């Protein structure tokens, strides 16, 4: 049937990009409590790294993002933590929670929580992240 992991991946990477944008705009503009924006910069960079390599489908031939081979090797190194979708979902939600203290990053938080939800959905289905071997 449908593979929610693909849409969860695409949503999570953009949530990370928006978190980076909101954190950078909080840091540069010296928004009061800019340290939450600084957290958003580091959390968004980490989300983009972790969510850049798309996984391999159960059926068919998948597309790979540009320069994903390097990222896939790193994500493979962490064993089950990247693989499990329960771990990925709880990681995304926990990283989203402190970013919700600033308006510039509230949009990131919501988007990351929407993604962690789709990861949760994929986790219930039995889906996991198997790497795309070359």
């Amino acid at each position: 049937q449908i593979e929610w992991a693909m849409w969860a991946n695409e949503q999570a990477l953009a949530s990370g990009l928006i978190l980076i944008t909101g954190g950078i705009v909080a840091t540069a503009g010296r928004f009061t409590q800019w340290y939450f924006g600084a957290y958003s910069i580091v959390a968004g960079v980490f989300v983009c790294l972790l969510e850049y390599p798309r996984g391999k489908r159960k059926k068919g031939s998948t597309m790979e993002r540009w320069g994903q081979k390097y990222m896939t090797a790193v994500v493979k190194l962490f064993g089950p933590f990247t693989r499990n979708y329960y771990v990925r979902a709880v990681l995304h939600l926990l990283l989203s929670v402190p970013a919700g203290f600033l308006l510039a990053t509230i949009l990131g938080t919501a988007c990351l929580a929407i993604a962690s939800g789709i990861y949760l959905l994929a986790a219930v289905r039995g889906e996991q992240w198997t790497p795309i071997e070359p």
Partner: protein, 529 residues
């Protein structure tokens, strides 16, 4: 590209003009002088992208009107036709710009909100806070839209979850990013059901966008106020405003909403188009024959009054019983000249299994269906070239069934109007299991020709990637192009491809190396369906 370059350049120039123009409509004039000091330069950087979003949002809905654009194209120079076939590439471009301008707008309104709250809680320069004092009392209009004294960052979160522009901004930002993140090529192609359903948050996006600017919180000094309040004299007398004759307290109003004036027409057009599509769903299509081919493919041969097709075209079929809401697209696999029109449907999933089960193919009445219309780009040109080299890979053979079946009819009907004389067909497939119906067509066209003593017409090879008659491995396109080049000298040949992109580059490269520069020389025009 005439039309493509023209439309893209005009659209980009209009965006640049609107941005520059509305940047200076909100930066130069003295009407917005005091706002530009509470908000700084982040006023115009919020309001020029808003004008660009006004224009872009009207544009996004127009090249996706499926039934209205087809009605226009039925009456609307093949060089031209293919440029206007890039309506879904223009939709994507407009949507990406909607994202870009929205991002600029959003970031600017984040500075605005910060600075507005900050001044309200005595955490800014003296002048902005003094300006924030307006609107507390009677007979004075605020300039600062933050009115509760809640310190940042909680003041910013309050304004978003209480201001109408903030609540609608958050809602349609979520409903814009979700559309975008659920519209990557992988979602659009591997999981179409997620793309289509989530793409309907557009109704929410436009509904939030229409009521987005109702509050008029971004306010400028009114014209009558400017007439009595000479700004250059009154700026430094803020501490005594209203108590000196020269400087009455300035009055600020908000601009009336403008976006509804833009998006009213396209939403109406899209609603009329959806009603036209519903009307096509109500129209009669009698399913004369259902043939169950091997490996779960059902050929549905059906008649609908007034259906005219062209080779290569596809239709959308809805079966109300399987899904009231969805139309699934299928290529017309029958000749244009036949009374009936056919589609060959391979059972791969939920709707298709539902049609199969409903039809009764499963068991030892037939469901009501509704065909949307010949859509797609025709491949009528196949007939014009004297020789052709159709190459179909995998599930891409399907378009060629209509074409191949049609050539026979034109040969029988006239035998002179068919300029075509030779067809070389290459089927590159992993296996022939699900497309066995096609092998039978290819055998027949040849058999009919052989009976009619023109055994020369149809030469075909099936090449099995997994590893006349079947062969193993892909064709050596280096060899094939030269061989046909030897047999047919001084002639133009069209290599029509309906297969993967890698194959498409391979053939185009092969075409050009093979095609002779000289006017006498064989040319190998390449068209990719």
């Amino acid at each position: 590209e005439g039309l493509s370059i023209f439309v893209i350049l005009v659209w980009l120039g209009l965006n640049v003009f609107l941005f520059v123009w509305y940047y200076r409509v909100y930066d130069i004039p003295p009407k917005f002088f005091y706002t530009r000091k509470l908000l700084g330069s982040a006023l115009a950087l919020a309001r020029a992208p808003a004008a660009c979003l006004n224009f872009n949002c009207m544009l996004i809905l127009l090249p996706v009107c499926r039934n209205l654009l087809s009605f226009l194209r039925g009456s609307s120079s093949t060089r031209v036709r293919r440029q206007l076939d890039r309506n879904l590439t223009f939709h994507k471009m407009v949507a990406w710009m909607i994202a870009l301008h929205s991002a600029i707008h959003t970031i600017a309104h984040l500075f605005n909100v910060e600075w507005c709250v900050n001044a309200r809680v005595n955490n800014s320069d003296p002048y902005s806070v003094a300006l924030s004092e307006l609107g507390d009392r009677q007979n004075e209009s605020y300039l600062n839209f933050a009115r509760k004294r809640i310190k940042n960052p909680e003041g910013g979160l309050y304004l978003a979850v209480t201001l109408l522009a903030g609540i609608t901004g958050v809602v349609i930002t979520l409903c814009l990013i979700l559309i975008i993140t659920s519209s990557t090529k992988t979602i659009r192609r591997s999981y179409f059901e997620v793309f289509w359903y989530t793409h309907h948050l557009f109704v929410i996006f436009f509904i939030g966008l229409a009521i987005h600017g109702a509050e008029r919180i971004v306010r400028g000094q009114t014209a009558e106020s400017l007439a009595v309040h000479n700004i250059t004299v009154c700026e430094q007398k803020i501490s005594e405003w209203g108590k000196i004759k020269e400087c009455p307290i300035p009055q600020f109003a908000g601009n009336p909403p403008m976006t509804w004036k833009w998006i009213v027409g396209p939403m109406f057009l899209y609603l009329c188009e959806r009603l036209v599509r519903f009307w096509r769903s109500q129209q009669k299509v009698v399913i004369t024959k259902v043939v169950t081919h091997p490996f779960k493919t059902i050929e549905l041969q059906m008649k609908k009054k007034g259906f005219k097709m062209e080779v290569g075209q596809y239709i959308f079929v809805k079966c109300p019983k399987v899904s009231k809401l969805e139309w699934h697209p299928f290529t017309l696999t029958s000749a244009p000249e036949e009374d009936f029109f056919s589609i060959h449907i391979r059972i791969v999933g939920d709707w298709t299994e539902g049609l199969f089960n409903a039809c009764g193919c499963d068991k030892q009445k037939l469901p009501k269906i509704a065909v949307d219309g010949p859509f797609g780009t025709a491949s009528e040109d196949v007939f014009s070239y004297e020789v052709v080299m159709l190459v179909g890979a995998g599930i891409g053979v399907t378009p060629f069934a209509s074409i191949l079946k049609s050539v026979w009819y034109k040969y029988c009907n006239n035998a002179t109007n068919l300029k075509l004389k030779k067809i070389y067909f290459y089927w590159l497939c992993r296996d022939t299991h699900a497309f066995e119906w096609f092998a039978d067509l290819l055998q027949l066209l040849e058999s009919q020709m052989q009976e009619r003593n023109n055994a020369g017409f149809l030469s075909y090879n099936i090449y099995l990637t997994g590893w006349q008659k079947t062969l193993y491995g892909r064709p050596n396109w280096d060899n094939e192009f030269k061989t046909i080049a030897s047999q047919h000298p001084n002639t133009r040949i069209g290599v029509f491809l309906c297969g993967p992109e890698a194959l498409a580059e391979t053939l185009s490269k092969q075409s050009i190396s093979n095609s002779e520069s000289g006017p006498r020389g064989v040319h190998f025009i390449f068209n990719k369906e």
